[PDB]
Design a protein around this nucleic acid. Structure first.
Ligand SMILES: [Mg+2]
Length: 1308
RNA sequence: AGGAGUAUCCACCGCAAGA
RNA sequence: UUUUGCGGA
RNA sequence: AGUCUACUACUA
RNA sequence: AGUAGUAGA
RNA sequence: ACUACUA
């Protein structure tokens, strides 16, 4: 039953009125929103901003720090070993007890070194001892720490403690003294970092990346200093645990030259913590800025630079731990981009310099530098394009205090690069090296690489927790000023065309023209009414009568907001928690429409929370309560069903199929430009006009904040759908009316922050005055970011189509190709303008005749008519309250940017660096296989977006190395299988500490799971043809794995579970600490799950069962883990605990991975072939193409061309038929028919499961336990960036990858 | 002494004894 | 308010 | 630490 | 289907 | 929660 709500009634809008208004608008002269990019213009902007910047911030004489960890290296760095640490620590204490301290941060260092050196032999055993092999000492109370009482500190040493436990300024960048001294300092640091310290791919990578990047880089001090900072950060991470951070610690590296004195500090496990330490080092080539050193002690002409007490956040500490890995990935990406750009291998100097710059950026994890880089990814598109908002973007570049010599150096390099880029409008000077590029894609990829070298969240704890609110507040106030000025009815119901003509200031953001909105809906209807039947089928497909809280979105773990608490703030709860609350407080499971009926009068409460980004300004997103979610879900379902049917709307596309859609749009764009347009004169003369394209990489200034939800109300009421009634349309209009006003709550952090201030600044006072109650405030028309993405995107497409119709009406003589692609706010406008093919004596005469006849709008179309189209569009969109951004919107004849992917003509390029640098993120500590599979599969995505197979293989190697280093499993560590097993590392099953198929092409095409099967087959052949001991040992290892699994295939093919082998780690998952977890006793959940086995695969559609199902979900250990607010260190500690601690299940007891490996070795030594286990192996046994392929290296330089995106069908409802298999009850049957897309043929797809399993594994899935095991394997098309010549089939992509194994060489 | 900043923030919590 | 000793984050 | 759009792994 | 990771708006 | 042969 769809309710009867108010339906808005047509205004009778006529395109004639809008085309007449557009004629009047284009008749006059319009100031272009953008400025032409000229070298003189950019240089003058830089000079004027330099002159003005001296007054912005108080002058700074002393530059602040830029290096989080300072250290120097003169000899090759051997990475730390426990023996080397203790030898180097003793040597370093002997070194630095000779020096004479002067500063308190030198006396503390000397007094901690003297304490450490006075630790007994027993102290040195527990020191550097694993936690399981550690004892209390009364001087070494933790594995890597030692006590240091104040009783053991000099008078000045305790003064350093007093400073720690007891006014923004900018360097004068206008002066040449600072721009010389700061650049000279970094040029000395970078040059020191550049100093040299005294499968098919495995071969190709060895000759290409290793000989030309990882080897060239291997000798530099940047490489060894990166290893030294890995070991420093490993010590700091080891010191940041809850119990180890209370005490001090001394560690040393590079034969005692580098010493790390980790002071007591708050454990990084808890938030708002910093790992305070002092690093002392002999002054030499490296990350040293002697102006920012605490001391430089002298002894025998030797300089010992004592660094300041550097407090480092957990995010920054983990950044510095992967600083070498991030720098190496960035340099490999730059290396590949250089190879594609110039066709030549980068020179040694260029690679060393770019690695030094990348490593300095990875070390200097500063939000100031991160912000400047964030502005440079906007500045480079601005100063490269034809017209852009480069003056305003450069103004943004100077709205920052340059407080450190790196920011001054980075700014100076930015200024030089931007001025040089504006000279040409190919050639593209590099930001990190001297070599100039040829493709803008390489430069933009380079600067995005620099930007992504800064980890997300490098912002202030509360400085940027407040800044998210102000951006929302002002537009919630600008709306109020707009409402007061225009009457609160013009703003909400919308102004008419005659009002706009009378005022002409109404064409402003947050104000929408009613006639324009209706006409945009009409132009969208011109497409919709063609497929009205499909539109109606799509709308009624959505979950309108299907129950709420049965869709995964309404029961997910994503946070939502509850109600206003007694404190007055908005309660921060989980989506599932609110689902369970409403289900408990209701006697039935409501549908979407019924829940909207019951929850339409509540207000759309909301709360904003920071999405921890790397942007200069953190973009916090809103969290909506349950009624707001149901309103927005009604609107988004309606406008996703409607939007899926039109092609110029892109948020409705699927993932990377948006890239294919925009690629096809651009292909048709240059297809139209491939021609000469003809204008028909009264004499019938055909003026020939050269068709040209202008790509506007449009960005919307404050799309969600500063818009009007009300524009959609007249949109929905006029957007036609094939539905007979207007019942659903009226419901959607009502929902849009209910999302007009929002209760914007500021976070508890911000409220306590403001409530902990002695005085309130005037701008803070203005910000707080927005909320009338201390916490709540009113937001009008500003639909929260991302909540109406579908609806707003479709509205933008409609307004662009309306402008297209208006332009067609205005100039029917000119055939102009028009292609708009709105995703949500990012948009790409291709405007086809007919430039006069000659000097234009005819064209100018024709335009003059048109103007004289009465078409005054033709003044606009003579010179550069694309400007006229963009102006008219920027206006039409403004009539729909859409402001194309003056800055971050760039027009260009050739280059375009959409969805953070850069197009050049027919070519596309997505920067895969983000995937590669993001592949070094946290891991699931499930186990060694789960962690190795996650690490190795994160780079396959990059291989798809453009990554070179080597650069992806190198990333896989780095990820695998990190994962091993957290799990032993490294050669010469503790859990290395080769120590206890009798096979090589490559010939070891992944569960038993195996690297597996490290090759990316196997992981890209086959999968990680197939490495165990690929091993089994590789064993089976060895035990089927040669009958050697190695493959028999491998089979014994696999059989031991199955013995651990305790699953039984019994008679060949006729058993209980399907297995390949696994190991069971001691996963400690606590009990749920949430409100709706004790409602039903866990025993009741046990009986309920054992009876209703169908619901393990389909969400129940009845409130009575759904309550029990959701209570069970709250008690799921994985779900409990996902909602306990853990930290990335406790995760790292948990992975590392699987090195020495009793974390593995062997037999019936918990043993270490050492003992599991030993038991596996014993079993595989004693294993004997039963001729039935071989039958099991045959069943358990895309890789055919990979093992049967070969390539020939032609002596010719590899050619590079346009890159496109193509689909990839690697493998040929899946989770609901199993529910029908166990469907025993009437309610379960109803739920399984509701969940199934086509319930009629359920058994038809069940018989395929019976036949498919019997064909492959020969198992009787009719048994309950058997079917549950085959479900995970039953459940298991991507989109890749290839070259233009490559075909869109599965094998062609692999052929291209094989051809791309080399980088400067050719492969046939 | 750091991190963050033309938004006041983080940089350790409790206990018992002694000065 | 400093320290010492004991625990927790 | 949200909404969509996905991709990749891993788990019943 | 659930989690983890990543990317885009 | 570490310190291996560290891609
Ligand atoms: Mg854009």
């Amino acid at each position: 039953y769809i309710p009867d709500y108010k339906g808005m009634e047509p205004i009778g809008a006529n395109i004639e009125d809008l085309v007449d208004y557009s004629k009047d608008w284009l008749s006059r002269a319009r100031n272009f929103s953008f400025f032409e990019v000229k070298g003189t213009a950019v240089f003058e902007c830089f000079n004027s901003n330099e002159a003005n910047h001296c007054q912005r911030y108080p002058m700074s004489r002393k530059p602040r720090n830029f290096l989080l960890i300072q250290c120097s290296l003169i000899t090759s760095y051997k990475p730390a070993t426990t023996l080397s640490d203790q030898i180097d620590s003793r040597r370093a204490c002997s070194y630095i007890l000779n020096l004479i301290p002067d500063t308190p941060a030198s006396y503390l260092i000397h007094d901690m070194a003297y304490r450490y050196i006075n630790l007994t032999r027993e102290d040195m055993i527990n020191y550097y001892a694993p936690r399981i092999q550690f004892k209390q000492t009364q001087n070494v109370r933790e594995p890597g720490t030692f006590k240091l009482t104040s009783s053991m500190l000099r008078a000045e040493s305790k003064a350093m403690l007093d400073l720690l436990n007891n006014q923004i300024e900018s360097l004068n960048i206008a002066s040449h003294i600072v721009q010389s001294e700061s650049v000279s300092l970094i040029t000395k640091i970078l040059s020191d970092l550049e100093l040299n310290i005294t499968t098919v791919l495995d071969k190709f990578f060895q000759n290409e990346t290793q000989k030309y990047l990882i080897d060239v880089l291997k000798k530099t001090t940047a490489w060894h200093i990166g290893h030294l900072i890995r070991d420093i950060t490993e010590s700091l991470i080891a010191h940041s645990g809850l119990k180890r951070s209370k005490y001090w610690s001394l560690h040393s590296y590079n034969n005692g030259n580098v010493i790390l004195f980790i002071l007591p500090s708050k454990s990084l496990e808890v938030a708002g913590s910093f790992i305070r330490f002092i690093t002392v080092f002999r002054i030499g080539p490296g990350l040293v800025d002697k102006d920012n050193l605490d001391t430089i002690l002298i002894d025998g002409d030797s300089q010992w630079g004592v660094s300041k007490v550097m407090s480092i956040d957990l995010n920054r500490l983990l950044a510095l731990n992967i600083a070498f890995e991030k720098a190496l990935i960035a340099t490999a990406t730059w290396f590949q981009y250089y190879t594609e750009d110039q066709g030549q291998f980068p020179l040694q100097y260029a690679i060393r310099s770019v690695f030094a710059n990348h490593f300095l950026l990875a070390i200097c994890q500063k939000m100031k530098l991160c912000a400047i880089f964030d502005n440079l990814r906007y500045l480079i598109p601005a100063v490269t394009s034809l017209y852009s908002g480069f003056p305003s973007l450069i103004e943004k570049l100077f709205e920052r205090p340059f407080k450190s010599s790196l920011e001054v150096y980075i700014y100076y390099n930015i200024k030089s690069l931007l001025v040089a880029l504006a000279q040409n409008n190919g050639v593209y000077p590099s930001f990190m090296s001297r070599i100039v590029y040829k493709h803008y894609r390489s430069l933009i990829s380079e600067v995005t690489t620099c930007f992504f070298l800064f980890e997300k969240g490098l912002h202030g704890n509360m400085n940027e927790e407040a800044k998210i609110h102000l951006e929302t507040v002002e537009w919630a106030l600008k709306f109020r000023e707009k409402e007061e000025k225009y009457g609160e009815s013009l703003v909400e119901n919308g102004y008419m065309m005659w009002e706009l003509r009378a005022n002409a200031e109404l064409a402003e953001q947050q104000l929408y023209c009613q006639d324009a909105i209706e006409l945009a809906a009409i132009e969208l209807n011109k497409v919709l009414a063609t497929k009205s039947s499909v539109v109606a089928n799509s709308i009624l497909s959505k979950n309108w009568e299907e129950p709420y809280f049965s869709q995964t979105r309404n029961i997910s773990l994503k946070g939502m907001s509850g109600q206003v608490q007694e404190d007055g703030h908005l309660s921060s709860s989980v989506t599932i928690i609110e689902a369970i609350r409403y289900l408990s407080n209701s006697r039935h499971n409501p549908s979407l429409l019924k829940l909207y009926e019951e929850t339409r009068e509540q207000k759309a409460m909301a709360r904003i929370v920071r999405k921890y980004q790397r942007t200069e300004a953190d973009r916090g997103f809103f969290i909506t309560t349950l009624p707001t979610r149901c309103r927005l879900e009604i609107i988004e379902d309606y406008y996703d069903a409607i939007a899926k049917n039109i092609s110029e709307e892109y948020i409705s596309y699927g993932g990377e199929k948006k890239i294919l859609a925009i690629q096809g749009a651009l292909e048709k764009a240059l297809r139209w430009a491939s021609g000469e347009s003809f204008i028909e004169l009264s004499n019938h003369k055909f003026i020939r006009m050269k068709r040209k394209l202008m790509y506007v990489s449009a960005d919307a200034t404050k799309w969600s904040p500063g818009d009007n939800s009300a524009k959609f109300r007249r949109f929905t009421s006029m957007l036609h759908n094939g539905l007979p009634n207007n019942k659903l349309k009226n419901c959607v209009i009502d929902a849009l009316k209910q999302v007009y006003k929002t209760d914007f709550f500021m976070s508890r952090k911000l409220r306590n922050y403001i409530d902990s201030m002695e005085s309130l600044d005037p701008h803070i006072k203005q910000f707080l005055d927005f909320f009338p109650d201390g916490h709540h405030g009113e937001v009008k028309g500003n639909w929260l970011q991302g909540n109406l993405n579908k609806c707003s995107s479709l509205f933008g497409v409609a307004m662009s189509l309306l402008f297209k119709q208006v332009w067609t009406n205005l100039f029917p003589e000119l055939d102009c190709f028009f292609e708009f692609a709105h995703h949500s706010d990012d948009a790409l406008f291709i405007y086809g303008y007919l430039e006069p093919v000659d000097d234009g004596t005819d064209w100018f005469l024709f335009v003059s005749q048109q103007i004289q006849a009465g078409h005054l709008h033709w003044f606009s179309v003579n010179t550069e008519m694309w400007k006229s189209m963009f102006n008219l569009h920027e206006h039409i969109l403004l009539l729909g309250s859409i402001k194309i951004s003056p800055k971050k919107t760039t027009v260009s004849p050739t280059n375009a940017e959409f969805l953070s992917t850069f197009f050049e003509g027919c070519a596309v390029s997505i920067p895969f660096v983000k995937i590669l640098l993001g592949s070094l993120s946290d891991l699931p500590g499930l186990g060694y296989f789960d962690d190795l599979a996650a690490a190795q599969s994160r780079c396959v995505k990059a291989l798809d977006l453009g990554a070179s197979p080597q650069v992806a293989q190198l990333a896989v190697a780095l990820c695998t190395s990190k994962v091993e280093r957290l799990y032993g499993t490294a050669p010469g560590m503790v859990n290395h299988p080769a120590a206890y097993l009798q096979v090589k590392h490559t010939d070891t099953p992944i569960p038993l500490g195996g690297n597996g198929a490290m090759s990316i092409m196997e992981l890209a095409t086959a999968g990680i799971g197939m490495s165990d099967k690929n091993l089994l087959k590789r064993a089976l052949l060895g035990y089927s043809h040669k009958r050697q001991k190695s493959m028999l040992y491998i089979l014994g290892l696999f059989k031991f794995l199955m013995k651990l699994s305790d699953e039984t295939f019994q008679h060949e093919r006729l058993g209980q579970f399907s297995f390949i082998g696994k190991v069971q780690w001691k996963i400690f998952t606590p009990k749920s600490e949430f409100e709706f977890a004790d409602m039903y006793t866990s025993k009741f959940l046990e009986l309920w799950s054992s009876q209703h086995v169908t619901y393990d695969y389909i969400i129940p559609k009845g409130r009575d069962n759904l309550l029990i199902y959701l209570v069970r979900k709250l008690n799921d250990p994985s779900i409990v883990t996902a909602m306990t607010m853990q930290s990335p260190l406790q995760l790292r500690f948990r992975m590392q605990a699987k090195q020495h601690m009793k974390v593995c299940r062997l037999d019936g007891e918990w043993v270490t991975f050492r003992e599991v490996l030993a038991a596996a070795n014993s079993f595989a030594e004693n294993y004997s072939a039963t001729s039935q286990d071989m039958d099991l192996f045959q069943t358990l046994t895309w890789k055919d193409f990979l093992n049967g392929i070969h390539c020939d290296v032609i002596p010719t330089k590899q050619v590079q061309r346009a890159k496109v995106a193509r689909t990839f069908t690697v493998r040929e409802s899946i989770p609901a038929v199993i529910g029908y298999k166990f469907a025993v009850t009437v309610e379960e049957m109803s739920d399984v028919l509701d969940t199934a897309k086509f319930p009629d043929s359920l058994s038809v797809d069940l018989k395929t499961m019976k036949d498919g399993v019997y064909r492959e594994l020969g198992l009787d899935i009719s048994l309950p336990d058997v079917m549950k095991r085959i479900a995970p394997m039953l459940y298991k098309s991507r989109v890749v960036i290839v070259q233009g010549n490559v075909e869109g089939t599965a094998e062609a992509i692999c052929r291209y990858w094989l051809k791309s194994m080399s980088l400067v060489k050719t492969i046939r």
